[PDB]
Amino acid sequence: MNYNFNEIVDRSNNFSSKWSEMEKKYGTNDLLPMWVADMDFKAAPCIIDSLKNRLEQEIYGYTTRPDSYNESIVNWLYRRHNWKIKSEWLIYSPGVIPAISLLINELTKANDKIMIQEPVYSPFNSVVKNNNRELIISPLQKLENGNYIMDYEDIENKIKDVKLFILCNPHNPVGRVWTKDELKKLGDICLKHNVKIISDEIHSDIILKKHKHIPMASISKEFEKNTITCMAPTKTFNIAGLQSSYVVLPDEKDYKLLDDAFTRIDIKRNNCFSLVATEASYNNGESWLESFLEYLESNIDFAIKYINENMPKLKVRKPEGTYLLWVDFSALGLSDEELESILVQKGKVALNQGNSFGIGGSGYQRINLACPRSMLEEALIRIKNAIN
Amino acid sequence: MNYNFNEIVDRSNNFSSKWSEMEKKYGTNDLLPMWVADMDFKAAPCIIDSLKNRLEQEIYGYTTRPDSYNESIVNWLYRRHNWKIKSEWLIYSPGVIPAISLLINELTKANDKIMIQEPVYSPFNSVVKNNNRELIISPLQKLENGNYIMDYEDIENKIKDVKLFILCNPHNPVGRVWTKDELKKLGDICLKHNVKIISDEIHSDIILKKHKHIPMASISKEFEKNTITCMAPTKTFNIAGLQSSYVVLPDEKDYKLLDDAFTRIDIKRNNCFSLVATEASYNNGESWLESFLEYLESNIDFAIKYINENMPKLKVRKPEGTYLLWVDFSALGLSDEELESILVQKGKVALNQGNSFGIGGSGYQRINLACPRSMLEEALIRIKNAIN
Ligand SMILES: *Cc1c(COP(=O)(O)O)cnc(C)c1O
Ligand SMILES: *Cc1c(COP(=O)(O)O)cnc(C)c1O
Ligand SMILES: [Cl-]
Ligand SMILES: [Cl-]
Ligand SMILES: [Cl-]
């Protein structure tokens, strides 16, 4: 199946933050954007048509969540991940960080310790601080072979009095898809220390060849009981603007706490478009997704070949998942400030600064590869210009 | 201008809570729905076409809020209400109650007292309780002429240590459009006792002939500084399914507190459809709104004539605003439970039970008149069957 991912789709009129909010961040908007994790691709045709059908009803009042909605999510998790859940475990949230934010408030008290692994998605750090909890960072270990693993010894050394661990699986920005054995080793630590895991698995569908997503909660019943899982159609199908995610809570007590938190802030219903797009994506979007992954892996291979051939001082490992590339610029001898400056000023390209991801980010930049080949090539040429 | 409000638009396929969620509330879904406050009318043509234009871009990623969005709001409030605000005062919220819930958490501490006037929109009561604050109720006074007013003596008597007053303007369900002098008397009390006012003005556009909405914050500079205001296009234009509302905070310290609460729960962006519909509704929807208000007032006059002629034991005062009719059934001598039973079982009609609005609701039912004349007639015939 072919969906014309090579097509240029200008988003200058698309009310896109990727294309329109670069001034606050970079000091100008006149840059090639490769930062924000959404895609410069059209949504799957089944999504577009589900929106069309809903639009053409012409009444946009309060929206009910039919059984078919959560059924689509149960069926997806089983057929894609071999993880059987119950529809009764699912809670709607407009996004992952909102859900994690309410969980932190309900599952811990002020100044309780919460652990994350850096470098990681920057909201993980801020959500803990903005809830007045104490952030404990166990940095991932970058091995001398250039790859990242969890630092299990460090996690043990820092685990005392920790109440929650936020796991990123696949891990953004480094692109790790954790193996079952890696997950088992972490989940055993947390079981032993009575630490509940919140697993952010939003990139669960964006997995490259020869890798497989394992939901942490899927590994065993003991892990299931000790893991809360956040997933969404939004990264997979490029529908973050529609606002749809879910939380899987196999423990009733946790379910009740989160449900009651959403009741307290009165955030319960999907918007009318999110509702139909989420079901359409999971029920009909598989073919588009497989095609997208083939296109993505080709972009990834192209970018790494380009960098190794044309920018050999840069260092990059191929990600196992996500569409995000994590590139080490440190051999240039520039400070993070100097590098940010040349990329913006000389390259005229917008990448996510490594240091924004916390410990272990210095010297790196994150590049979004979910864009047409031609745009990716332009981006790489601009980076080449920046550093030469 | 004519928009064919007479047209039947079956919503059995429209994922509508009004048409689809009666089972949990009433015991069956086989009822004529006149309960939930959304309309059985198509959205304005300008709103449908804005949604079509956005849909046809075919990319639905993270959405930026262009200056034109808050400009449309500022211009509406001046044109319609003669209230000049600054765009810098506006905060996005997916809904009014979410905003109020965050305001309560940030402006008060646990077990602080918050005052409301019943009977009122039931989330006013629950939002205080679900935030572990203490609810103080000053019931509206029902005068011997059948009209409602504020009980200013009661408010004074119960004011000590109240931190916040949640005002509904217009007041759902009784249909009061408070006069400037009524609002001055309240706001003077609150200023005097250092009680901040949160004014829910979501029905601010749904105003009948010979009445005028007065934003509480618009009355004086001193009231502007002591009033936070929630408004939305959703009730006005029947777009609750798109999720859009705003808060007006003229005091920068209040702005910051709410801003930071939204940051804490990571709810910052409009969904892509809400963004375009809100600007379209305010910029282009005025002619539709004036036509809808003519249609509504005719429905209201028809219903009151029908009730007075055919169900003379019932008592009803014409509302000044909202599309909601507040009808007293107490002369039938039924308990609230008995009345609900006969309306559902015998009438097969779904109204909002009066007692759900708190003190002063017993014996009443609320009827939604934002529907075609034909459907309204059918609803009144069902009610007459129920009570005979
Ligand atoms: C992009 C992203 C999210 C998105 O969070 P929302 O609150 O749904 O927008 C969450 N987690 C990770 C790891 C991400 O990369
Ligand atoms: C219907 C209604 C609302 C709607 O609140 P949201 O949280 O925006 O859905 C708010 N206030 C009043 C008085 C209402 O009648
Ligand atoms: Cl180089
Ligand atoms: Cl009077
Ligand atoms: Cl009668």
DSSP class per residue in A304-348? HHHHHHH-TTSEEPPPSBSSEEEEE-GGG---HHHHHHHIIIII-
Judge if A305 and A234 occupy the same domain. Answer: no
Asked if the Cβ–Cβ distance from A241 to B60 is below 8 Å, we say yes
Shortest CA distance to A274 belongs to which of A5, A9, A102, A72?
Answer: A72
Chain A residues inside the 8 Å CB shell of B273: 242, 271, 273
> What DSSP character marks residue B10?
-
For the record, the structure tokens of A169 come out as 């699986």
For the record, the structure tokens of A113 come out as 């310790």
Question: How many contiguous H segments (helices) and E segments (strands) does chain A have?
Answer: 15, 15
- Tell me, in angstroms, the distance from the centre of ligand 5 to residue B333's CA: 11
Which technique was used to obtain these atomic coordinates? Answer: X-ray
Instruction: Work out the burial of residue B3: count CB atoms within 10 Å of its CB; fewer than 13 is exposed, 13-18 middle, 19 or more buried.
Output: middle
Residues with CB under 6 A from ligand 2: A 266; B 37, 95-97, 121, 168, 172, 200, 202, 232, 234-235, 240, 245
CATH (domain of B354) = 3.90.1150.10
Shortest CA distance to A122 belongs to which of A355, A367, A363?
Answer: A355
Q: How do strand A245-248 and strand A90-93 relate by DSSP bridges?
A: antiparallel
Q: Spell out the alpha helix ranges (H) of A82-160.
A: 96-107, 122-130, 152-158
* A contact test, residue of B17, B46, B264 with most A CBs within 10 A: B264
Contact of B166 with B100, CB cutoff 8 Å? yes
Judge if B113 and B127 occupy the same domain. Answer: yes
End-to-end CA distance of chain B, in Å? Answer: 40
CB contact, 8 Å: A40 with chain B? yes
Q: Is the CB of A121 under 6 A from ligand 1?
A: yes
Contact of B347 with B200, CB cutoff 8 Å? no
Shortest CA distance to A375 belongs to which of A29, A34, A25, A43?
Answer: A34
Distance CA A258, CA A247 (A): 9
Distance CA B316, CA B313 (A): 10
Helix or strand or coil: residue B156?
A: helix
How many folded domains does chain B comprise? Answer: 2
Contact of B372 with B3, CB cutoff 8 Å? no
| Residues whose CB falls within 8 Å of the CB of residue A312, separated by 6 or more in sequence, listed in order | none
Nearest to B98 among A47, A239, A267 (CB): A267
Judge if B93 and B52 occupy the same domain. Answer: no
Report the DSSP beta bridge partners of residue B316: B327
Q: Is the CB of A254 under 6 A from ligand 1?
A: no
Judge if A100 and A141 occupy the same domain. Answer: yes
Place of tokens 């400009």: B71
Of A227, A249, A283, the position where a domain reaches its end is A283
Among all residues of chain A, which has the CA nearest to that of B236?
Answer: A61
Of B283, B310, B330, the position where a domain reaches its end is B283
Other beta carbons within 10 angstroms of residue A149's beta carbon come to: 16
Contact of A67 with A86, CB cutoff 8 Å? no
Helix or strand or coil: residue A25?
A: helix
Judge if B123 and B232 occupy the same domain. Answer: yes
Kindly state the helix (H) or strand (E) to which residue A278 belongs, with its residue range: helix A272-284
CA-to-CA dists, residue B378 to A305, B224, B341, B382, B383, angstroms: 71, 45, 19, 6, 9
Shortest CA distance to A190 belongs to which of A213, A211, A166?
Answer: A166
Cα B107 to chain centroid, rounded: 23
For the record, the structure tokens of A165 come out as 């661990």
**Which of A:222-251 have CB within 8 Å of B?**
238-243
Distance CA A264, CA A119 (A): 33
Degrees, nearest 5: CA angle B104-B110-B113: 70
Other beta carbons within 10 angstroms of residue B311's beta carbon come to: 20
Distance CA B92, CA A94 (A): 14
Distance CA B208, CA B206 (A): 7
User: How many angstroms away from the CA of A94 is the closest CA of chain B?
Assistant: 8
CB contact, 8 Å: A12 with chain B? no
| DSSP states of B160-217 | TTEEEEEEESSBTTTTB---HHHHHHHHHHHHHTT-EEEEE-TTTT-B-TT-----GG
Distance CA B71, CA B76 (A): 9
Judge if B106 and B157 occupy the same domain. Answer: yes
Shortest CA distance to A91 belongs to which of A209, A224, A267, A233?
Answer: A267
Other beta carbons within 10 angstroms of residue A283's beta carbon come to: 15
User: Which atom of ligand 1 lies at the shortest distance from residue A322's CA?
Assistant: 15
Helix or strand or coil: residue B116?
A: strand
What letter represents residue A98's amino acid?
A: P
Report the DSSP beta bridge partners of residue A324: A368
Ligand 1: residue of A118, A125, A167, A202 to mutate (most ligand atoms within 8 A of CB) is: A202
Other beta carbons within 10 angstroms of residue A305's beta carbon come to: 10
Distance CA A85, CA A52 (A): 31
Asked if the Cβ–Cβ distance from A48 to B55 is below 8 Å, we say yes
Kindly state the helix (H) or strand (E) to which residue A134 belongs, with its residue range: strand A134-137
> What DSSP character marks residue A62?
P
Contact of B143 with B317, CB cutoff 8 Å? no
Judge if B73 and B167 occupy the same domain. Answer: yes
Judge if B190 and B293 occupy the same domain. Answer: no
Other beta carbons within 10 angstroms of residue A86's beta carbon come to: 10
Other beta carbons within 10 angstroms of residue B8's beta carbon come to: 10
Enclosing domain of residue B14: 1-61+284-386
Q: Spell out the alpha helix ranges (H) of chain B.
A: 17-20, 22-26, 45-55, 67-81, 96-107, 123-130, 152-158, 180-192, 221-226, 234-237, 252-264, 272-284, 286-310, 336-342, 373-387
Judge if A212 and A335 occupy the same domain. Answer: no
Contact of B273 with B242, CB cutoff 8 Å? yes
Burial annotation B188-222 (CB, 10 A radius, 16+ → b, else e):
ebbbeeebbbbbbbbbbbbbbeebebbbbbbbeee
Judge if B68 and B32 occupy the same domain. Answer: no
Query: What strands lie across the sheet with B245-248, from one edge to the other?
Result: B90-93, B245-248, B227-231, B196-200, B162-168, B113-116, B134-137
Of A260, A283, A306, the position where a domain reaches its end is A283
What letter represents residue B13's amino acid?
A: N
Distance CA A175, CA A207 (A): 9
Distance CA B169, CA B229 (A): 10
Furthest CA-CA distance within chain B: 59
Distance CA A221, CA A250 (A): 10
Q: Is the CB of A96 under 6 A from ligand 1?
A: yes
Q: Looking at the CA of B385, which ligand is closest?
A: 5
Contact of A17 with A29, CB cutoff 8 Å? no
Distance CA B167, CA B178 (A): 10
**Which of B:305-344 have CB within 8 Å of A?**
none
Helix or strand or coil: residue A38?
A: coil
Judge if B257 and B210 occupy the same domain. Answer: yes
Distance CA B218, CA B144 (A): 31
Ligand 1: residue of A120, A171, A200, A369 to mutate (most ligand atoms within 8 A of CB) is: A200
Contact of B27 with B344, CB cutoff 8 Å? yes
Contact of B108 with B257, CB cutoff 8 Å? no
Distance CA A180, CA A175 (A): 16
Helix, strand, coil percentages for chain A (3-state, nearest 5) = 45, 15, 40
Other beta carbons within 10 angstroms of residue B265's beta carbon come to: 26
Kindly state the helix (H) or strand (E) to which residue A382 belongs, with its residue range: helix A373-387
Alpha-carbon torsion, ordered B95, A269, B359, B211, to 10 deg: 40
Burial annotation A337-375 (CB, 10 A radius, 16+ → b, else e):
eebbebbbeebebbbbbbbbbbbbbbbbbbbbbbbbeeb
CATH (domain of B111) = 3.40.640.10
Distance CA A299, CA B148 (A): 68
Instruction: Work out the burial of residue B29: count CB atoms within 10 Å of its CB; fewer than 13 is exposed, 13-18 middle, 19 or more buried.
Output: middle
* Bond prior to A123 in cis (omega within 30° of 0): no
Helix or strand or coil: residue A16?
A: strand
Handedness of CA B247, B248, B252, B254 (dihedral sign): negative
Judge if A274 and A177 occupy the same domain. Answer: yes
* Bond prior to B372 in cis (omega within 30° of 0): no
Distance CA B326, CA B315 (A): 9
